Every structure is written in C-alpha cells, then in structure tokens.
Amino acid sequence: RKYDYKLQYYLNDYVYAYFTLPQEGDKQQAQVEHLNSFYNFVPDVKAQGQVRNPSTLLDSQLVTVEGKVATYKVKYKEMIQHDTEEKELVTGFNIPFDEKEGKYYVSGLPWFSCIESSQAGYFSEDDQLQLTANDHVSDSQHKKVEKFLKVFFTNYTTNQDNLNLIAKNVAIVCNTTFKTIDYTYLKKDRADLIAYVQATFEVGGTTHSENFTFTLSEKDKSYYVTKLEHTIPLNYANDKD
Amino acid sequence: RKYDYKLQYYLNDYVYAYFTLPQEGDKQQAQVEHLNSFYNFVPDVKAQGQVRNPSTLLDSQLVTVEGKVATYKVKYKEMIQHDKDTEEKELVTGFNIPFDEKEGKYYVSGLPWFSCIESSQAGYFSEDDQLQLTANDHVSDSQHKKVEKFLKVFFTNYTTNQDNLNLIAKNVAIVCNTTFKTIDYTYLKKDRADLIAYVQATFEVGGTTHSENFTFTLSEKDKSYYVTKLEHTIPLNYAN
Amino acid sequence: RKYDYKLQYYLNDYVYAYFTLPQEGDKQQAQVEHLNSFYNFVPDVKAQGQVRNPSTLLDSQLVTVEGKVATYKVKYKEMIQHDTEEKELVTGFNIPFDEKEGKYYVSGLPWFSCIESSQAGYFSEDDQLQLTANDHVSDSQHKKVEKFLKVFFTNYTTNQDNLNLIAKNVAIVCNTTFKTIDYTYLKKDRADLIAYVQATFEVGGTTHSENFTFTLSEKDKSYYVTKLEHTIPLNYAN
C-alpha cells in the first residue's frame, strides 16, 4: 500500500458539502440533505434555529488525520446577494469520523479551531552558521583547489561525461551558468581534503549563492570528488577545537 | 523517506496522455507517440482499427497504489462527431494501471483496465450506534448550577483569552473568530473525585451559528472547577 | 497518523516566498523579510549585491522528502521590464530543513538541480509481451472455455448476482458493453485451467482491449473463476 487517498477524498467531499450553501431557498434544501448523507445519523442538536448565510468554499486542505479526528485548514466566503455583502474567513475544522467495512462516515458534530503557525523559533545562537574562518593552508594548495573547482563547477553546469571523470555520483544541473567561487575553507582529514565552498550561479537573469562540502582525493595533479554535500556543517572549522 | 510522490506524478502523466486525444489529425499523431513512451513496449492488441474519438481529461485522482497496480478515478469528455452536429459526452470511470520500477524509474507494463468508482460512504447502521442526547442525570441541582456558572466563564475564555483559559484548564488552545452564545445541553456524571460534563453549546462565526459537543473532566478547585481533560465528542455510551 | 501534510504545506510556503518577487521596488523589501522569517538564521552570503528580477511562481510540487532535504519541481517566470521580457523556467529545488518540537525551519541555502526523468528504458527484448503463441490444448476445451467466457464477460458487464454464480470475489464494471474475445491461450496447471485472454469492451463510443488471467475450476458442465488477474504474465506459454 504505497498510497491511499480514499479517506482524504471522502473528507474533502464532506468539507465541500459543509461549507457550501447557495442563496435560493429551493436549492438550499437539497444541499443540506447532501450534507446529512455523510453522517451515520444526523447529529442531535438541541438549539432551536441556527442562522446560516450562503457560503462558498474557497480552499480546503487536510493537514492531519490522527485517530478518528481529521483536521483541515479552510478558507470560505459568506455572501448575501440582494449589491453584495461578503466576508472571507479562514479557520481550522476538525471532523470526527469512523470506518465500517472499508467505508467511511462522519460520526459527530465537527468543531472549529485556530490554524496553527508551522514556523519554529527561539533558536540558540550556537546554531548559526557563520562562514568567517580562514584556514592556515598553503597558497599553492589553495591555487590547486581553486583551479580544480573552476573545472568542476564548469562541468557541473555543462557536461555529464566530463563530470564523471572528476566526481562520483554527481548529477549536473540544468539552465545554469557558473560565475564565482566566493568562499573556501580547506581542512585536511587524513588522506582526504574537505573543501567547504560557497559559489554563485546564474539561472535566467538571476544569481544565487549555494554551499558545498567536497571530499577530495588526490588523483594525478588534481582532485577526485568522492562525496559532495550541499550544506556546510556548523562544525566545519573544528580543526580549531 | 517522509514523502514520495515520484510514482504518483508519473502515473498522473500517464493518465493525462491516455485520456487526451486532440482533433487536429496532425497533432493526433504525436499524442499517441507520447503515450507509447510510457510503456516498456507498446501493448500487443489483436483487435484492428480501434475506434478512438477526441477526448479531454477533465479530472484525475490517484486513489490507491497496491503492489504493481495503481487505481485512479477519472472524469473525461469525448467529442463524438455526427453529420448534423457534435456530441460531447462526459464519463467517469475507475482506471487501473499495472506498473513496475527499474532502478528508481517507472514504466507502464501492460494494458490498463476500467472499473467502477467505489462509493466511499458507509451505511446500513444499527440504531444502537446513534448518539441520543436525552437524559437527565442522577446528579444534584446544586452541582448543576455550579457547573453551569463555570461553563460560561470557560466558554467565554475559550473564545477570547489564552491567559484566562490557562487558569481554569490544562493545555486547551483558544479558538479564533468565534462568539460564545448558549449552553444547550449538559449531563453530569460523578466519577469518584472527578465530574464528567457532557455538553453541547452554540458559537457564532461570521453570521453563522453552529452547535458543538464537549466532554469536560472537572476537578474541584477553589469554589469552582478545573478542566483536566477536554474532548470534542460526546461518547455514545455517556449515561448510566 | 494516516496523513500528515504539515511539513509539505510549510515547504510549499517557503517555495512560494522564494520564487515570488513583485515589481514595486518598495513592496520588494517586505517580501524579502517574509522569506527571511523561514530560516533559523538568514544564511551568510559572501557575494555582494546580487541581481533579483521580479518573479512569479507558476507551479510547485514536492517530489520527495529524505532526511532533512526536501526536493521540489518548480515552474516560475522572471519579468524584466524595459518592452517586457518574460523567461519561464523549470528546475529542481532542494531545501535543507529541520524540526524543533513539531515546528519547522529552513536551515541553509537551497540548491538547484535538474528535474529527473521518471520513465525507465533500456529494456531486454526478452521482456516484451507478445500474445502470439498457440496452445497445444484440445479443440473441445477451447469451445467450452469460449462459451463460458461469453457468459462471464456478459455478467462482468451487467449483473452482480449472476457473476457470483460463476466467479469468487469479482466486482462488475460500469458503463461497459462486452464485444469480442480476441485471444485465448489455455494451459493446464494441476487441477486448475489457466486461460490467458484478451477481450474488447465499449465504453461510450470508444472501444478498448484488456488482458485477463483466469484460474478455472470445473463446476457442473462448466467453469468457476477462482482467481482473476488483469495482466498476462511474460512467461505465460510455459
């Protein structure tokens, strides 16, 4: 079972039924019967007479399903057309459900919640990556590395066969021009040479920087790339600890 | 591997190539070669002169993948050309695709086949499974009042202020864009030191009012209650 | 936990912030601050200055998440006004991320890649499925099978109760007329008789072929379908 969307598509239908209500009172009956068809039993509601404006579902996304609770994020619009009065709302919307013999139903009244922000904060300053150290390495080694990297970065943006000469398992990139090496700290690791590198590429008319960790093996007068990452680790200059 | 859509996007492409055929006879050639590129080898079909009208794919969704079989739900329209006019007939069906993988790459291995779209809605329910909110509890009139007085504060806070809510309840987030309106129902049940309230109440969001259900687990604190646990369902077997 | 899209929706927001830059050189500042809010710390960039044209995100899809690396496929347009030049580009776009207490952040500069083709090739010709063999099986069995399969295929397109008489656990199909059996190779396997079959169905005004493997058990004067597959195996004429 690599994929199973049956539940999700079901609840998507529920959510549409619930947040959809047209203006014409005729057609407004059928809509509610469509909605009631989702429940095992229409929920027992003591309240006398709910008020209910016409509504359109603008956007729905299932964020999680945990136990017998599905949680959506919803954006819907409430309209009275006479001239038009409108409001747009977003909310969380939580649906209690269950399964009978591979079939689904809504089991209960849904409930509203706030959409939670996903972004983390409160970061230790110890977790920041500053690219400010300098290595105490030869200018001659720096020249050799620098000369290798222009070839590498040329190949990495242009030719797969050439890249395979100087690097293991590295795919080339599309639609890109190499421009500049802007940073390079070198660290000997027994027989390997780690290069931590930031460089500059142009895609269309726009340039971006990216970071690399190269693991270099000596071959001929030059290098071979045994391993390439796309992040510089925080502990990159730990030849100093 | 938290997420992997590679297969799904692939099959999405297959399904579009299969249910798409334009009118322009020049463009209609290339479309078939595009389709044939999905298979390892174009499937062997004995029947000659298949009848293939133009069609447009209106909608496709992968519903499951099991083994080397993908199952879609499809809505497409065929453009059937008469003499006097043209017909546009709209069909939905299920559509099952046999596939395989070579070294993290994909291909369609076989002729796909059509099926009925499964209804996902359950039915034929025992009446024993319904939630009937009718009873009056065996529980004191005075407790009824104290709970009722607590719940207006709770519900006020639950819709208005996080700090206040934390005084009277553990780990309960407030709700957005909501006004409290009414408590409409309340059955109380003694559980040793705790008091379970089953509660239905009425909120206004925008210009619309909805009912919702709660199970509170209430602990005595001061002259009042503390909310140890809050659920958003009343359980079927809630009474005595 | 059947479903959890929290990460995916997060990275969708990142990708929109990154590939979006409006023309107004002032509302262009707030956009960058919106983008910077994703990272734990705004990445340290040694290169000075940098050229950034307005851009609109046309399309994004997360293809994989592996470790702390998300990989997208992206389609965006760059808008250069001087009249208007628009470049439309697709690329891969890889985002390094992490989680603190069920929350997310982008941890580093993202990087571009080629969108990998998903289609396999380089197939052995031994793996092609040709329906071209003829069985060395009696002409009388051929007739009995043929007569069964018209009933089966009629039922399979028309009536569930009838289908259950002649087959275990086979759902009928909707909106379909049976038309023709176009191929049939028969093979005894111990007690069962395997039929490999291709037939022709009409849905709307269009006809398609499909393939079946039936496992047939003798019942009465006829067959019972113990197992139905929808693919003929490569090694069928064994």
Author numbering:
A (entry chain A): 89 to 170, 173 to 331
B (entry chain C): 89 to 328
C (entry chain B): 89 to 170, 173 to 328
Direct quotes from the study:
The main model of our study is OrfG, the sole VirB8-like protein of the conjugative and integrative element ICESt3 found in the Gram-positive bacterium Streptococcus thermophilus. Bioinformatic analysis using constrained consensus TOPology prediction (CCTOP) predicted that OrfG consists of a single transmembrane α helix (residues 37 to 57) followed by a large soluble domain (OrfG64–331). This soluble region comprises two NTF2-like domains OrfG64–204 and OrfG223–331 (referred to hereafter as D1 and D2, respectively). Our data confirm that VirB8-like proteins are predominantly extracellular components, assembling into a conserved pattern, which serves as a building block of the DNA translocation channel.
To confirm this hypothesis, we used a cysteine cross-linking approach to investigate the ability of OrfGExt to form trimers in vitro. We introduced cysteines to replace facing residues at the interface D1:D1′ (K90C-E154C and Y91C-V153C) or at the interface D1:D2′ (K134C-D272C and A204C-A264C). Notably, under nonreducing conditions, variants with double-cysteine mutations, particularly OrfGExt-A204C-A264C, assemble into high-order complexes (HOC) (>100 kDa), possibly corresponding to trimeric form (theoretical molecular weight of 93 kDa). To confirm that the trimeric complex obtained using cysteine cross-linking conserved the same structural arrangement as OrfGExt, we solved the structure of OrfGExt-A204C-A264C at 2.6-Å resolution. OrfGExt-A204C-A264C shares all the characteristics of the WT structure. Despite various measurements carried out to characterize the trimers and comparing them, we observed little adaptation to the constraints brought by the disulfide bridges and/or the change of the crystallization conditions, the overall arrangement remains unchanged, as anticipated. SEC-MALS analysis conducted on both purified proteins revealed that OrfG-A204C-A264C mainly assembles into trimers (right), in contrast to the full-length OrfG, found as monomers (left). To test the potential of OrfG to function as trimer in a biological context, a orfG knockout mutant strain producing a full-length OrfG harboring the dual cysteine substitutions (A204C and A264C) was generated and subsequently examined for the presence of multimeric complexes. Mating experiments demonstrated that the strain producing the dual cysteine mutant conjugates at frequencies comparable to that of the WT strain. In the absence of DTT, the OrfG-A204C-A2064C membrane sample displayed high molecular weight complexes including one of approximatively 130 kDa, consistent with the expected size of OrfG trimers (40 kDa × 3 = 120 kDa).
